[PDB]
Every structure is written in structure tokens, then in C-alpha cells.
Design a protein around this motif. Sequence first.
Motif, short mmCIF file in Angstrom:
data_model
loop_
_atom_site.label_atom_id
_atom_site.label_comp_id
_atom_site.label_asym_id
_atom_site.label_seq_id
_atom_site.Cartn_x
_atom_site.Cartn_y
_atom_site.Cartn_z
N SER B 327 52.77 32.94 43.83
CA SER B 327 53.00 34.30 44.22
C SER B 327 53.40 35.04 43.28
O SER B 327 52.79 36.34 42.94
CB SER B 327 54.28 34.52 45.33
N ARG B 328 54.34 34.63 42.32
CA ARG B 328 54.61 35.82 41.02
C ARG B 328 53.51 35.61 39.89
O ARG B 328 53.67 36.47 39.19
CB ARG B 328 55.90 35.26 40.51
N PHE B 329 52.67 34.76 39.81
CA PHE B 329 51.33 35.03 39.12
C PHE B 329 50.33 35.91 39.74
O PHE B 329 49.52 36.69 39.09
CB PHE B 329 50.89 33.70 38.76
N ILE B 330 50.06 35.87 40.93
CA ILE B 330 49.03 36.42 41.64
C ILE B 330 49.44 37.95 41.93
O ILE B 330 48.46 38.80 41.66
CB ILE B 330 48.54 35.83 42.70
N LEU B 331 50.39 38.35 42.38
CA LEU B 331 50.87 39.70 43.05
C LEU B 331 50.70 40.74 41.90
O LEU B 331 50.20 41.92 42.04
CB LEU B 331 51.93 39.34 43.75
N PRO B 332 51.40 40.40 40.68
CA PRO B 332 51.26 41.37 39.60
C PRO B 332 50.12 41.66 39.12
O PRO B 332 49.77 42.77 38.76
CB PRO B 332 52.31 40.77 38.46
N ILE B 333 49.15 40.59 39.21
CA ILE B 333 47.81 40.91 38.64
C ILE B 333 47.08 41.72 39.54
O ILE B 333 46.35 42.74 38.99
CB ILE B 333 47.30 39.60 38.28
N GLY B 334 47.21 41.58 40.74
CA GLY B 334 46.42 41.98 42.00
C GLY B 334 46.91 43.58 42.09
O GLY B 334 46.21 44.57 42.69
N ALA B 335 48.19 43.67 41.62
CA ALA B 335 48.95 45.16 42.02
C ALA B 335 47.92 46.02 40.78
O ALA B 335 48.15 47.38 41.07
CB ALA B 335 50.39 45.17 41.60
N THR B 336 47.41 45.55 39.71
CA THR B 336 46.83 46.59 38.75
C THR B 336 45.37 46.23 38.73
O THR B 336 44.55 47.00 38.01
CB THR B 336 47.56 46.38 37.31
N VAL B 337 44.84 45.17 39.47
CA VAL B 337 43.31 44.84 39.47
C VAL B 337 42.77 44.96 40.46
O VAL B 337 41.73 45.80 40.79
CB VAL B 337 43.26 43.36 38.96
N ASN B 338 43.12 44.38 41.78
CA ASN B 338 42.41 44.62 42.97
C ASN B 338 43.12 45.82 43.65
O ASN B 338 44.16 46.23 44.02
CB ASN B 338 42.94 43.56 43.96
N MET B 339 42.08 46.93 43.94
CA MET B 339 42.19 48.34 44.42
C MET B 339 41.15 48.31 45.46
O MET B 339 40.19 49.16 45.05
CB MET B 339 42.45 49.24 43.44
#
Lengths: 122, 440, 429, 429
Positions: B327-339
Motif C-alpha cells: 500500500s505504501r508503495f502503490i498509493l503515493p505513485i498512483g496519487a501522482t500518476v493514475n488520474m
Amino acid sequence: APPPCRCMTSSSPYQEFLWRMQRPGNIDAPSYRSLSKGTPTFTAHTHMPRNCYHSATLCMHANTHYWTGKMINPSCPGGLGVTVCWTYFTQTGMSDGGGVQDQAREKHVKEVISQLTRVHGT
Amino acid sequence: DQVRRCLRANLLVLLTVVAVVAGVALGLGVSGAGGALALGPERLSAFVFPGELLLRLLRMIILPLVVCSLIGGAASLDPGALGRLGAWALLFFLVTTLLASALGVGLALALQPGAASAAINASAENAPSKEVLDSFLDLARNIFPSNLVSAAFRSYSTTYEERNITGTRVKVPVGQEVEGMNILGLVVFAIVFGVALRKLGPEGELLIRFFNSFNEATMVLVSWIMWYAPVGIMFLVAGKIVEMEDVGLLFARLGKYILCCLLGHAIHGLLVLPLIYFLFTRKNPYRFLWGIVTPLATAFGTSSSSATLPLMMKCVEENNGVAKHISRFILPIGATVNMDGAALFQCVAAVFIAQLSQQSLDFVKIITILVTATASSVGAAGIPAGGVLTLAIILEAVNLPVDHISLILAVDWLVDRSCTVLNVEGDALGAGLLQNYVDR
Amino acid sequence: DQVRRCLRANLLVLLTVVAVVAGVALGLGVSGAGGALALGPERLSAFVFPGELLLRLLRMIILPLVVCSLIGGAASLDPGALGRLGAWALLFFLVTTLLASALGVGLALALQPGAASKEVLDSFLDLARNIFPSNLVSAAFRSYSTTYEERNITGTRVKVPVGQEVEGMNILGLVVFAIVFGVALRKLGPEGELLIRFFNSFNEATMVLVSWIMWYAPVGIMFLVAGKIVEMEDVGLLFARLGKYILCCLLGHAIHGLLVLPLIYFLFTRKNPYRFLWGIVTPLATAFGTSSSSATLPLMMKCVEENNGVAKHISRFILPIGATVNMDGAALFQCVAAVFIAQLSQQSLDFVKIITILVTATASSVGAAGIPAGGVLTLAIILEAVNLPVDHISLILAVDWLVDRSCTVLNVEGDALGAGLLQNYVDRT
Amino acid sequence: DQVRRCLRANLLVLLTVVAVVAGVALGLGVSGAGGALALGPERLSAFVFPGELLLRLLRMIILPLVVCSLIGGAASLDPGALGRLGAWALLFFLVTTLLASALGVGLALALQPGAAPSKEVLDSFLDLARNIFPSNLVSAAFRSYSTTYEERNITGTRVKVPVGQEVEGMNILGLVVFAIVFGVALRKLGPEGELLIRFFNSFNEATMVLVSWIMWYAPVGIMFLVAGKIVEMEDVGLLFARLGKYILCCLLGHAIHGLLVLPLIYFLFTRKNPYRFLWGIVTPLATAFGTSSSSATLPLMMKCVEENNGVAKHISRFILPIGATVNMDGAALFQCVAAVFIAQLSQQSLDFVKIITILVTATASSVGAAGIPAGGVLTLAIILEAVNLPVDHISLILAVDWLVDRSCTVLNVEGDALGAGLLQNYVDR
């Protein structure tokens, strides 16, 4: 109605080199090609932060409105204590933390809202 | 009683939904019996201050949380395993972005928001544009930030120097660092630092312990802020409703565009992402949605995916118990990539602008607008009103007039919140699929 | 000889005194051949440069010190510290600190030791925005402040307020963040200890450097005083405002303890305060002699067990450990000094500034480990938070030699009275 | 065959040297086929981007590397030994800078290549002193201090008063000083500081891993930097016909200083072969010529000096970060030659006192100059104002500034490495 703009480029290449070297986030020396040469001409920036000018006024050049003012910081575009000109609107999707460009953006959007509401009324 | 236990267990989510309802009701009541005119500007600022305070509280936490969480997550897994997980995550992100963009384009073509076009309603001057290559170079420069301290509060963006207006304009580009957190560069640096820490050894172990303790303390602060969050959400919703003028009159001709945007958001959030979760995990996606109600409502209140990342991290950790590292690796990346919501916004808005100007859409234009929307959604800022710049880049790439952007900014206050909801939902669902995969 | 050792142990105080006198002498000698002479107003920043260097050095080591010290201090508290008794003691100490600060600020403005743009009342939201910073690294060097414009669009004189980040170094927001992070770190458990050790080691490292700066301080103080005398007149109001101020603050905190601790002793114990005072005379006289709370610590223990009805456990809880952030008199000193400095600069500090100063002062009511002139660093932190001028601190450091003994007497009186209240409370239960 | 094994051992050296040569070849080839006129603006920006990416990558890690390496190095030796080593290091730096400046002045006088707000030299020295002791560590991490003149008095008495403000930069010198002092403070403490020492050592090791990855990326960026710099030329023939004597003076002085003077000092004080040491540091020298910045090539210099040559860990991490800022011989020779060239352009005679001022101000400017590309151009204004006859038409110096700046960077980093080796031998003795 606004007075004509008096916003020339750098008189000497060294001044342009000095202010382009000290811009925020600079990583490399500016090329000699990119420096302005010959007789000075009108120039305008597309973005200028609010913390660079004490006040700004409108000016006219080639039937186009521009903002003019005096810079207060050598890290700001144009140098230190140099009267420079910048565009009426900033870049789309870009903000300058208030200031004249922002105030113009909200002025334009409120005018659009007003005329579109009037269109709805008709 | 069982009902008493149910309210005690779910006290926060009920408080959040009651706060949203009370904020909408209070905003409508104040607007009907007054508004920004009945009370002065000072009273308006005092009225809207608690929501801004909540937004500031969430923004204070983002930097240490993202940095420490990504360092720990990258250092707690093998470099090969981290690479495989990141590659699959990027594949999921691009798949969701393409699906959302295609759905948005189809709905925008079916309902035709710009068919009537009212009375054009455009002229002062034309705002300067940013070249496509310059925007991609700007993205590449924000990755690998020049200064770590300076990237924590300002980011690179290229500007232009319009020279010789009568003398054959050249538009020389000069770049500078403007205000706004460089989340992406810090994320990349944190991942690289984590893999280096894993490559090191026992010294890396000491630094790993340090950063994990920092993240835990930051989570305690998040737990404290999450309780204040409902009041700020209520005041944000109420103040934004009150400040905005002439409800309905704006909607009387923008209803088609609003319907396109919200219908695309609803279909993507209730039939596409849940379908992917059900077909990949065979669980109930709506239980996952129920666990993450209050991050979705906080995102709706704040209109910023970056702000709602800590609340989503905590809710993903406690409810629907995804493991901490993934969770702590996926969520920060998706917060700026997956839109996803942003991509749907930009596709619908660009099609609406094209229909305003009576231009054919053909096939290759649709292909290039989809590709540029997907490729420019990544790297977009998570701040409110962050999709306007990427939409402008899309418009420049598709060669459409820009002067009608004011109609897009006219009603963006609500659809941007919907976009934030869709983005955070895509983040959470991707975390769910990855957690189910690593469970197997 | 014993006197040589005595002077060596108090080497810093004598050095500072001789430095102030020599700075005054150098300023008087240069003035007359200065002003329009000695390079004129131009090139003035050459005589005063060592002092500006000292000011920069003090401003450098402020941020890590405040952040790390408050994180460590906040994580060192304990609800479990004897449960109710520790909570009651911290609460009582807290109330005393908040009331002493209010009394000092009130008496300061009441007498006005000093006095020989326009910001609205609604500036409290700006303060509340400052205390809860949006960005932590931006808060390390700049702070939010609202300005005003004129639009002339909807009528005339709208004066719409728009805010921006200018300067200030935003210590107060950092103080709040440090306190919350410290309590969260304590709340964590057997992980939090590593970070606690990290930050305490950082504070320890910062303190040796602070001691080094305190050694560099005299040349800068001398040059500050010299530069400050020439730009003004010595016969002018600066002297009379110092006689007003040193004496004012002295008598202030003096009567402060004299009537405040006695009232809290009586209304709560219904005993005779002068009997309590008569028993602890010789620690008070030792405090007057040494000007150091750390020096008189053994004596308070001896006088408190027999002369007052403290038990061993209650005494060993109040006199030590309780001494941290215990200095009430120091707080009165820094509040009076900050108010005097504000009127010295002729600045309108209406209400919100006053409250923020009072709060920051109660908070920094810590520090000094109890050494003489230990309130100066916290007073500097107070001046930094309120964006008041700091360069006039040398006049305050000029004459602290006499007020600090009075402050120490007030501190030891507060310690003894708190011990008396706590011992009576635990006897009656 | 052993040829392939030798190639495997020195693959990095071969890649960097071939990258430099191929960058030169590609720049000449592209300039022949259009010279950026056929490329156009967008293609030119896409062509020159990868070198900028490498520069940004190297600037990303310079701050943590310098801070942590200096803390560990200062904490790895006793304060007395560190003081002796620092005194010898600054003596060596001063002597080498003076020799380089004297050689530059002599060669410019012999060959004769010659045929807006102001800034006082006292204010420049005060700005350097202020940058040595920063007022805010976080602010000093990304910006520096510079003075400004404004008219605030009445129009009858128009005098320039100096005011201070912060300009964009790095202020690496103040962070270096603070890190050294912090390391000394950490060594002053006992077991308390060991956790912090291990913390900073771990952070430095991780930064070294990132350094290894970035230097593996480096050759492509170096090639594109050199190619882009060559392509940007406008009129090579006229520019060479105008500035050939000046380019010859600068490069000949640099070559003499890097192949005769510094090796002679090293041989007299070390009695070894200096060219073996130079062979050990080929790769950082080529990287410095590629990137034209002493800060970017500092990590590769530290790694190559530590591994290829026999230099102790503490010696390299304490000396090389200091010398990357304060020891710049090539910049000194550049500035001296340019000042003499500009003075001869304006037909202004230079007597003994002007030459002495040029030497002293060049040493001070080289101390104050920054390790950024074309960093020595900025302090040329300080030198010209010191002579005050050469009005600042430094515009004639430019358009050949990149090549001479690159020679300056190679000379500076070579001097740093040779000093590190000399100090290692002196410690070993």
C-alpha cells in the motif's frame, strides 16, 4: 488609451547573461546564440510572479495590451531595476499567486459568466 | 444493542456523510437568504477559513509521508520484485487511463455538448500557449529534481519570451522554477534512495528503521487530523456553494457538458473499476468502496488528490487490510500518476471545445487526443485546478482554438471534485488488485 | 586564591560587562569624529559588521534547536508520572506561567517603559494560518502575511485583502509541529525511542555550538552597542529608558512573586506565607549570591524536608525534574524586555501581536538549564517569532547581571511554594 | 588475450574519454551540416537536453553528499589534528591560487591579447563573509546573499546605502562551514554522537551508490553537452580571428599550471610520480571537462581518489569538498587574463599597484566564486570594479566562454586532487 510601452531588451550581452544565470532553478550557462543582439527591440515575458513587482500598469504595443513594471529582485526576469513588459494573461493552467495576470484571469472569467448568464436570460 | 455497536464502529464515516449533507444544506440556505452580498468579504473569509485550515493540515503531512513511505516501501522489497510490481502497476494505470479516456470520448460524442453552442459567446487577447515538446521536457526535468530542498516547495516550468512582435516573433523559450511542490521528483528520488538503501546492508537497516519510525509518527498525526476533517469538509462545501453565483442559470446551457462529465465519472467508478476488481480478485468491490467512503468525501471536499493521500493510506491499512509495504508503495505513485477522472475531464472538455467551433473529429484526431490525454495525465499536479494546464497542452496538440477555455473554467469547481473522486478510487482499486495478487 | 577561581567560573559575565563598557567608550570616542564623518552615513555597515555577524550566527542556530529541543521535551513528559499528582503539578505550573506572563505584559504596557502599516482586527485568521503551516520546508524560512490592494471596480475603496508568503522564518508553526510530533513520538512506543535518541543527540550537538557562539558573542555585543550609540544620542532617551526598563522589570517580577505566590499559598492552604518564607531564607540568599538555580539545588532539598512538611517522594518529585521549564521570573524578564523593545522601535503592536508574544513566552519559559543569562536565547526566539527587531538585545544583555539574581530568587520562591502546595495536597488526601 | 581483460578493468575510463571525443566529433559534424540553422529551435532543444539531464542528476545529490561527507570527515579526526590539516590545506590553496594568478597576469602581459548597477569591493567582501555564516540553513540550501544599492534619503543628499537581499544560488560555502563545525561538535560529545555519526555515514554510502549509477549514465550526457556546445556557435572564423590570442593565453596558462607547476609542487613535497596520480583521476577530469562544473565532478573525484589512489577516507571527505569551493586556480587565471585583456582593449595602462590589486582581488574572487558552469564570469565584475578603469564590457569575453570555463574546471579539480594526495602523504610521512 494606455501609454506606449518602453520595454527594450538588454543593452549589453553581459547584463542578459547575468540575469539569465541567476534565474531560479538554473542548471547551465546560457548560450551566446540565445542572447539578444543588435539594436534593442520590444520583448515580453509570458509569466511573472507577484513577488517581483511593487505595482504594475497597462501599456499598449502594436494594438496589444501588456503589463509593465519595475523589477525588485535580480533573480526575477529582466534583471534588477529594469523596466520590463509581460503579457496580459499568464500561461494557461499556470498561476502567479495573485497579481495582475491572475486578476485579469478572474476578470475574464467573470465577464464570460456575465455574458453567458445574459445569453441564458434571452 | 447491535445498532449501537454499528454506529460506534462506523462513527467517522457517518460523521463525514452528515457533514457533507449539512454543508450542502447550509450553503444553499445561506445563498438563498443572502450570499457574498449579504455578508461582507471579511465575513466570507471568516466563514470559509476552517476548510482552508483543513486543506493546509493535509498539505503539511504530504511531504514527509510520501518521502518516508516510499523509502521504506522501496527498501522492504527486492529490486526485481519492486520492478515487477511497479511495471504491473504502470500497466494497470495506463489501462485504466485509456478506458476512462475512451469512455469520456464516446459519451462526449454521443451527447454533443457543443451542438447548440448557444451564441458562440467567446475577445480581448489570446492567452500564451506551451509547446508540446516543451511540456514533455518539463516533465522530464521535474523528474530528477535539481535541488532536493527547492523541489520540496517549487517546481520547474518553461516560459517564453515573446520578442519582436512586429519583427517576426521568435518566441524564445526560457525556463524557471515556479511555486508548487514537485511531488514526482521527490517520489522518484525516494524510490531510488530506497533501492540504494536495500543494496547497502546494515547501514541501510538503520536508515530503514529511522524512516519507518518517522512514517509511524506521521500516521499518528494523520489519525489526529482525520477527526477534524468533517468540519473542514462541511465548511469547504458550504463556502464554495455560497461564493459561486447564479446556480442553475449557468447550468441551463452547460447541462449537457455537466451530464457528460458526471455520467462518465459515475460509469467509470461504478461499472469499470469494480468490474476489473471483481474479475481479478473475485471479492466485493463495494465493500472496498464502503471502507474508503470518507477519503472519497474528503477528496470531494478538497478537490485535491495529493491532500487526501494520507487518509486513503490509513483507511486502506485498517479496513480492507492491504499489507503495509504494498500500500505504501502503490498509493503515493498512483496519487501522482493514475488520474482517470482528470483524463475523462480533458477528453470531454476537448470534444466540447471542438464541437463549439464546428470542426470535424475524424479518426486520427481521436487517436491522438486519447494518446496525448493519457501521456499528459501522468505528471499532472494533484493540486486543485490541476487539469487545466494538461487540457491546454492537449488543445495545443489537437490544434483547436483556445479562447473557449473560459467556458471550461466556468463550471470546473464541481467536475474537478468529481475527477478527484475518480482518481482516488482508481488508486484504491489498484491497491486492492495488487494486494489480492500478492495474497495468492 | 579563591577569588581567581571565582572570577574564572564567572568569566563570561565579567567579559560581557567589560565588553559593554568598552563598546560605550568606543562609541563615545568615535562620535564627534563620526556621524557625517567616519565615512558618513554611507559605508556605515563596517563598524557594526561584527555585530551583524553575531546576529546572523544567532539566527542560524535557532531552527534546529527549537525543533529538536521541543520534540525531545515533549516526548519526555508522562501522564503516568504519579498519575494525578503529576498532572496537578503540571497544571498548576502551567497556570502560574500563563498568569505571570499576563501580569508582566499588563504591567509593562501599564507603565510604558518605552515611547520616550494598518492591519485589521481580523488578522487572527492570518495568525491561525501561520501556526498551522501549509508546507514544512517553506515554513523554515518564510511566513504568511496578508496585504491590501485597491481595485475601484465595485464602488470605491474596496481594499480587498490578498495574502502571500514574504518572510518571518515561521518559528511558531514549527513549535506547534514540534510539540505535536513529540507527543505522537511518545505515543508510538518501542520505535519512537530511536527517533527520540536521534533528536536528543541533535540537541546536545547544537548546545556545544551554542556555547561557542556565546563565546563569540562579546565582540558582536561591543560592536552592536558602539554602532547603536553613534546613530542616536547617548544623553538621549536610550539611557533613561534603560533605567526605566531595568528597574521597571526588576521591581515588576519582584512584587509579582511577593503577592502572587503568597495568594496561591493562602487561598489553597489557609496558612501563613511568611512562615514558609522565613524557613527558606538561606536558599534565597544563596540564590541571590550565585545567580544560578542549578547552584542552589542541593540547599533547597535540605531546607525543604525539615522546615516544611514535604515527604521524601513529593520533595524528590517537585524540587528536581520539576525544575525543567520552571523559571517564572525569567518569563517576566523576557515579556517586559520584548514590550520595551517594541516601544523602543516605536511600533504599534495592538492585540494579536501581544497575545502571540505572551504565548511564545509561556512556551519558551524553558531553557538556560538555569545558568545565568539563560533567558536571553529564549527571548531572542520570542523576538524572532514576532518579527520584532532583534538588534536592540544588546542593551538588555548589557544590564542582566543585576536582574538575573532577582529572577533566580523568584524562581526558587516559585519552586518552594509549589512544593508547599503539593505537599499540603498530598497530606490532606 | 589480456587486452580484453584490460579493457574490462578500465571500461569507465574508455567510455568517458570516447564520450568526450565523440561529442566533439558529433558537434563538428552537425555544425558542418547546418549549424543549428537546419536543426531549428525544437530539434536543437531535443538534441541538447540529455546533457542538461546529466547535469541535473549530478546537482541532485551534491547537497547530501557534501553535508554528510563533511560531517563524517570532521568527526573522524581529533579537533587539533583537523585544525592542523585545515591550516595546511588553506595554505596550499592560497599558494596555488596566487601562483596561478601571477602566471595568468604575466602571460597576458607578455602576449598582449587586447591589442547597470555597480558593486563596491568592500560590499563584495562583506557578502562573502555573510555567505560564510548563513542566516538560515534551509534558505542557504538553495539561495545565497547579495547586496543592493538604493536611494532612500532625500533628493538633495543622494548617497547609495547598501541593502541586503537573497539571490538564487547554492551557498555551498556556508553549508561546508556549518557541516565542519557540526562534525567537530559531534566529536566533542562522547557516546551520544555515535548514533548521528552512523546515521550520516549511512546516508553518505547511499549517496555514493546513486553516484555510481549516475556516473554509469554519464558518458551519453557528456557527449551531448559537448556536441550541443559546439553546435551553438555562430561565426567561428570571425570569433577565432578576434579572440585567438586570448584563447591561447588562457589555455596555455592552464596547460602550464596543470602539467608543470602543480606536479612540481607535488614531486617536491611527496617524492612520487604526480602523473601516476593524474592517471588515477582521468575519469573525473574528463567528467569535469564534459560538465564544466566542479560541484558535479566532486563525487567522482572522491571515489576515484579513494579507490584508484591510496588516500584515506577522512582525508578525501574533508579536503575535497572544501577545495571544490575555495580552491579554484583555473578561475583565477581566467579572471586575471580577462582583466588584463579588457584593460588593454580600453588602452588603460597597468602599473605595479594595479597588478597587485588584480592578484589579491582574483584570489578573493576565486575563493568566492561558485562551482557552477560559467561561474567565474560573475566575479570578473568584482575584479574590474576593483581596478575601476575597465568598465564592464565583458561581452567580448563571451562566445568563447564555454571552452575556457571547461579548462578552468579541469584545472580546479586537478588542484584539489593533488592537494588531497599531498595531505595524505604528509599525514602518512
